[PDB]
């Protein structure tokens, strides 16, 4: 199965309320493994997954050193964009940054990411070629030129292709039981009468990992996409996820409906029918 490693960074300015709030989290697939928070007491990169707690002082000291560095960088960046956009010092602004690498089933490099957003709008993004930058506007173009001049893409390329992938495979192995597990969803349906002529049919997918899943309803094999109530995949809170899809069935028509579940840890897709 393909895997990925991503680092998400969020910085918010607190005008007259101290220095910007920085929150850094790291993920391997759908599993968070580390964290840093500017408002934290420790001021250290902390583990958020058992398997990463096995890393030594060297690792924790280096990540702490590097993450605080990112923190500062984002403190500068808030001021910088504020300048680029001729914005008031009173306004609270958000800078988010994301970077990571994906590896195929072969655990080989597939793609690297390095994007930024300012107040929710894409600012700049490394293009797939790992050689060019999508500068959103004039401001983002200023940053692009700086980066083309400083040859940032080349240093990133080496990271995204080398280091990033190297650490991913390491995490993958070191946290095997967790990261290299596929929990098939525990499915089941509920039937609740909504009226004297209709009923709700809900199909459940629970305790599954990874989060990738397809949960659909069909009437006579015909898809009911337009008529299905499908919720966003929720985290169970224990490392597995949940999701449901519901349809309103006219009484006596339950048999026409089939729910279908597709998931990596499922030997063969499921087709559930109320009967």
């Amino acid at each position: 199965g393909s895997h990925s490693m991503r680092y998400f960074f969020t910085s918010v300015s607190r005008p007259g309320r101290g220095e910007p709030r920085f929150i850094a989290v790291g993920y391997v697939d759908d599993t968070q493994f580390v964290r840093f928070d500017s408002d934290a007491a420790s001021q250290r990169m902390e583990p958020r997954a058992p398997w990463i707690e096995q890393e030594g002082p060297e690792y924790w000291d280096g990540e702490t050193r590097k993450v605080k560095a990112h923190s500062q960088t984002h403190r500068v960046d808030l001021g910088t964009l504020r300048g680029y956009y001729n914005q008031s010092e009173a306004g609270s602004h958000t800078v988010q940054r994301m970077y990571g690498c994906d590896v195929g089933s072969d655990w080989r490099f597939l793609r690297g990411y390095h994007q930024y957003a300012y107040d929710g709008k894409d600012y700049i993004a490394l293009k797939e070629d790992l050689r060019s930058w999508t500068a959103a506007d004039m401001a983002a173009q200023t940053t692009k030129h700086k980066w083309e001049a400083a040859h940032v893409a080349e240093q990133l390329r080496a990271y995204l292709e080398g280091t990033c992938v190297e650490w991913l495979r390491r995490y993958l192995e070191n946290g095997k039981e967790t990261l290299q597990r596929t929990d098939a969803p525990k499915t089941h349906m509920t039937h609740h009468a909504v009226s004297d002529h209709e009923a709700t049919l809900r199909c459940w997918a629970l305790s599954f990992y990874p989060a990738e899943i397809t949960l659909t309803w069909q009437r006579d094999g015909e898809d009911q996409t337009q008529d299905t109530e499908l919720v966003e995949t929720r985290p169970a809170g224990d490392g597995t996820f949940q999701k449901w899809a519901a349809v309103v069935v006219p009484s006596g028509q339950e048999q026409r409906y089939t729910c279908h579940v597709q998931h990596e840890g499922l030997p063969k897709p499921l087709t559930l029918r109320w009967e």
Partner: peptide, 9 residues
């Protein structure tokens, strides 16, 4: 693990 180079916008 994090990137060791730290760029600024």
């Amino acid at each position: 693990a994090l990137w060791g180079f730290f760029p600024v916008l």
